[PDB]
Amino acid sequence: MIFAVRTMVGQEKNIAGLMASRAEKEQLDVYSILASESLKGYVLVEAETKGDVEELIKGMPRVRGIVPGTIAIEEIEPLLTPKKIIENIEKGDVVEIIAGPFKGERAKVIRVDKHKEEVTLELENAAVPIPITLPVEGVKIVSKHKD
């Protein structure tokens, strides 16, 4: 059986980890845990019974209950092939321009515009003497910002 468990948004992978270690420690009949980025605020727990999942999450912080019913295997199959890997571009990230005349040119993200879905880029090529602005989708992450 597979159940959907509500979680704090952005903490799905962390709760899945905690669930996994708890399940092993306490020898609960929990066979897998799925956290899909298509199901934000939700972690799917595969177990023998609902009681196993109730035991699993008992007193677990940042978890707010099991969704009524079950999740059939048909609903899970599509989650195994995710689509549209929409990267989170941040200030300080090093990126590479995907297409166009500057294909392959690398740049540091000096600024990010969420309202417009754009990023401003200090290019490594000194031939372009000014930061240029592109849509997020014309760029891929080469290296994440360091902090």
């Binding site: 799905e12 669930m19 899909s36 980025e37 023998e48 360091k146």
Partner: protein, 67 residues
């Protein structure tokens, strides 16, 4: 803010297994830092999710990886 992206695990390009290593401890192919989704297989022989994913070794896996 202390995001610490370098401390996050990489994913095997062949089998999607999560690890900090440059190469996969399971199948020895290169890993990538470019992955999404999490499937934790605790019991592969009893998990039908793992059966559907083609996973027969227990561990944490990305749902997809590119590089």
């Amino acid at each position: 803010h202390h995001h610490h992206h370098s401390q996050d695990p990489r994913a095997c390009l062949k089998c999607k297994y999560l690890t900090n290593d440059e190469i996969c401890p399971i199948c020895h192919s290169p890993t990538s830092e470019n992955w999404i989704g999490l499937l934790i297989v605790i019991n592969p022989e009893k998990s039908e999710i793992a059966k559907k994913a083609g996973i027969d070794i227990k561990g944490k896996y990305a749902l997809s990886v590119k590089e």
